[model samples]
Target: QIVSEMGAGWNLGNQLEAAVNGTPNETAWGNPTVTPELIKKVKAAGFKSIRIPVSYLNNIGSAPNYTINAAWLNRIQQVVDYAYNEGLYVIINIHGDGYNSVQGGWLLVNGGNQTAIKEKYKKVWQQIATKFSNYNDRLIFESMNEVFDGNYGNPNSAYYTNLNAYNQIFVDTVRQTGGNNNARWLLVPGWNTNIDYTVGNYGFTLPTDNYRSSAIPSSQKRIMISAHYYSPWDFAGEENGNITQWGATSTNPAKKSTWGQEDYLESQFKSMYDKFVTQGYPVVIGEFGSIDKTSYDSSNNVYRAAYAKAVTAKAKKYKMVPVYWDNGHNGQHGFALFNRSNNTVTQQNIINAIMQGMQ
Candidate 1:
């Protein structure tokens, strides 16, 4: 029931993630200001949910308080309201704020700064939870996006340990805020939101929730695991002028790509289903997309369409909600779906393909 409610989701990317010296600007990434009409159009396109990634680093005040700026918070509230009012399931997460030592972001979880990190994380979520405490189940809070503790992929690394700590704090802080937040569904991502890592023993550690309601029972919690899929990067994210084809077989021998077949897609989701969903934990494919490389040859659109369809279909088959990542780049390498300028879908074929899977 929870998975079906999520349906297929979409991401409002590159907007809030666009930063100038760590401050967020909706237009900083060159996309027009988000409006209700655009969200309505997305619903019309058959998307049941929307994920909005926000960066609070630039809008946060000094520690030990680390208060978020009201103006920025208000702006986010307005955009989230637009989606929620439209009857679309909304997910708001901390994005572009997870970086390692050399680069800067507020959410880095490392051994050296673990103490400071935990304090700030609790402070951020306490404020956020209190601010949106009244919202119903439709408004979900995702803990963080692709967190790493300078250690990229070690199961025993401090990054995973601290990542789990942050998630625990997120659950504890929100539940204590009262209101509907006590039972509100929360999405927690694995290391880097990677499916393989998340399903692996090393990747995820489920957080415990104290709140027990009639709806949740004694053993259940309103929490879900989050993962991202950009498998076979050659076809999904490779930017070099080579390899535009996807899927296992292609009519054109020269254009046929070799990796990321339908079978592989199914196996990944099945692993997730067995590891999480089947065990009573719901899962969300927080972001997935195949970049548009159709500029070189329009035929690439055919492959892109097929890839999107396959992903959406497999996600649904495994009861995992798949959300497309739209960076608002309409040209080559862009994953744009809706044209925000006119409130129309730029790639109707892509939309149609994705919707076909949902049915």
Candidate 2:
């Protein structure tokens, strides 16, 4: 029921995740400044939640202090307030801190720096949790996003040990803040936020929310597992590829793009449901979407719509919530859902397709 309350979600990407000259800028990635109206538009479009990915790369100070900039913190708070005030569930996470093709962030977790990295991680969440301590259950905090370390894919790797330690610190720190956070729903991501790896042995271990002094029992733990899905990357992510179409076509079984069909989609969710949801832990599809391939051929829109609908529908069927990945770009390979300039939807069909799946 927790995932159901979240319903369909949307990610506010490329804004706070943008880093220019070492500072995070909301419009650095060609997206307009996020306004209260923008969040309101998302709720109006049938999305019940918003995932705000934030990068604290340049906003922090020295190691021991880890002082977050007051201005930047205030700006993030304003955006969260916009969403919370709209009666929408909100998820804020430490984003772009992992190793990627982008800039080198400070959240590198390895044996060489495990001690120092753990210290910084604790301080960062302490500051964040304390700042938003007064918020209610509608506000959820995600520990990390796509954590890349010495154990990127190997679950048995030492990296997962460190990752689990970080997750434990996040849970303990937030609970000690002594507010609604004591029972606030917190999300912990597995390695790379991949479904298989998360459900695999290499994924994160759920942290106990029971603080020694708190009256809440261990059974009252409010936590959820998060993972991303971009299955059939050829159809969902590839920019230069021949497979623009997705789903099975009986007419041309050989010619049609045949991988990641509905069966594969159902299997992914079924694994999650059997492993987590049925066991009382909710799962959230923190990010899932396909690039718009209509620009290549107008006919591709049909497949794009099918991909979106199928992903969202299957996610709900298995009790996992679906949150579309949107970077605010309206063109090819861009997952922009709304046109920020005018505060309107760029593609009504795409939004409709996602909602249709929820139905």
Candidate 3:
């Protein structure tokens, strides 16, 4: 019953763009004007699901137990309705809310204020669950988005451990909603929300209490583990062309042509994948993709294309769903699937080459 929340994409414009534009309200239904047309295109392109990341905490003040604005809720519902109408599975979760001070700690850090955090967590879920309670099984719920350490926020901290602890709270809050939500599938991510963390020794330590005695009870079979693969981030990240500390720099790093280099990178992740299969957990690669352009041209393209194929193949072999993260038409970085202005792949030939491997 733990189904994959396939074809996930963030609210690129609504939440993130609002911050960029200095907009006061952080609405959901990102680019509502373009949603219907976009949904039609997604449906036509064989997408079956969408994960709408909403940031209510930033829009609504963090105090007063984290209130969710009704207008924001309505905007989110509109997109959910569109997905349902299109027969697509929909997932909505608290995204940027974690960035706020009130929800800052992954787990309850300060014991004195733990109760308030729990209440805030529950309040958000209650409103979210209540808003969509009428929807059927296809409407899945994700607890939080990308909770982890060592990347954007904190490093070498107890954040991962804290995230594992907080997940239990998420499970309890959603189930307590007490309606169709009881059997509704929940998608939980590992520390950092990265595949490496989920598959490694740090699996989201299952809950012990709830409907059953186990950490993650069998009653919660509808819960699926979520992980993202942005390995060698530069190749797959928003700033695809820029070299990151985790990825290769220069057109062809020293080992560009060597099998050893590819194997080393692949092995790093293969171990992560092995851990998931060994543990008997269902996983969805909620995010993965590479931009189409790179300074290296032929060499980087070949390496990237091969890397994607290998990763996707391995994921499929493990029975995991691989969802490509398409960030619209910013072809300069490689994440864009099509040019927004003209609706064409920057390098149609390269796309054609990659499509063959994807098939």
Candidate 4:
């Protein structure tokens, strides 16, 4: 499988995905612009792939045309080249547009005008798929990130139908582009890229790939599943630091979270594996990382390292690709792995732990 060759991945997060007043600003999150040297370092450090989250909200124009700014589009190509030319698998997707928490997010399925939204959506993906039409299979296009109605509860059927239609549009638009994109791999997620919502009895549906190139191999799958991890929010995301320990390495019971511990972690991955991987479609843990809580507890990195190790090990066991999420803000509760200012490695222990788990 291609994902078996893909191995572990990393996110060029907080850079291209950063926006201010509806404009994509690479350095707005306080990280330096992407440099070729940084990607070279990443390849040398052993990451096999990179998932780039991009936003085209304000950079796109209105109505019938729905054109994208050439400048913004070219910049994206430049960044993608940094990883693609270096032999690393690259995944780029529309982010923030599906998010209600951010300004200029217009790809919502939550009661928006369906006709107008789908038209704009088709136009955007058409332009994107055609732009990279010449790129080989190493460059993968993900449909969108965490698409939903902004409700953090069970999905309503009406809204979910709209979401599934969006994925279908993505698949159809890219396939009709008639180039390398015709057989290229595509990634899709359901309802915030949540594992339980997608693998369980929710309204998740796979887009048809009937339009793929006939020359493509019958043994391969052109569609993949996008799964993210931030389990036990109190430990993985919340900086309040109530639950700082995770996995078997955690010694302090008082600091460990009751839910989403080691067993829960395995069960979560198991659900996705049974649902997708065994079916020949690869599951990508597209985003997974724990914030550094060392400021609250000096030993927090130990647990963070263990969490990384466990997550990667499980991904390895299940034949899924786990990509580390690094927002480029290396500090207390930050998810950065390398300091962008000078391109130096910052979290060696965590990085080491991730590599160890792959074994």
- How would you order the candidates by TM-score, starting with the best? 4, 1, 2, 3
Give a tens-digit lDDT track for model 4, residues 274-351.
999998888999999999898888888888888899999999988899999999888988999898888899998998
Structural similarity to truth (TM-score) of each candidate: 0.95, 0.94, 0.74, 0.97
* Candidate 2 C-alpha lDDT tens digits along 94-179: 89766544474767665477788888888989999988989999999999988866444466567777777878888888888877
Name the regions of candidate 4 deviating beyond 4 angstroms. 214-220
**Model 3 weakest 10-residue run by lDDT:** 15-24
lDDT of each: 0.84, 0.83, 0.56, 0.89
Candidate 4 residue pairs in clash (backbone atoms < 3 Å): none
lDDT of 3 by residue, 1-359 (tens): 23334433322223322332222243322222435556665555455666566555444546565666777678778867877777787777666555433343323322345567666777778788888877888887877776644355332334555566667777777777765776676777777666555655644575433643234456425666777776655455544344322233334454333232345556745665576545555566666666554553545555555655555555554556555555554535545444444433444443443344334
- Please rank every candidate by lDDT, starting with the best: 4, 1, 2, 3
Please write out the lDDT profile of model 1 over residues 266-313, one tens digit for every residue: 889999999989888888999998898887667777778888888898
- Supply candidate 2's per-residue lDDT for 244: 71
Counting only residues 3 or more apart in sequence or on different chains, how many pairs clash (N, Cα, C under 3 Å) in candidate 2?
Answer: 0
Off by over 4 Å in 2: 150-156, 212-216, 249-255
RMSD for each of the candidates: 2.1, 1.9, 5.3, 1.4
Q: Point out the higher-scoring one by lDDT: 2 or 3.
A: 2
Candidate 3 structure lDDT:
0.56
Which parts of model 3 have CA positions greater than 4 angstroms off?
1-33, 99-115, 150-157, 202-204, 208-220, 238-280, 292-305, 339-359
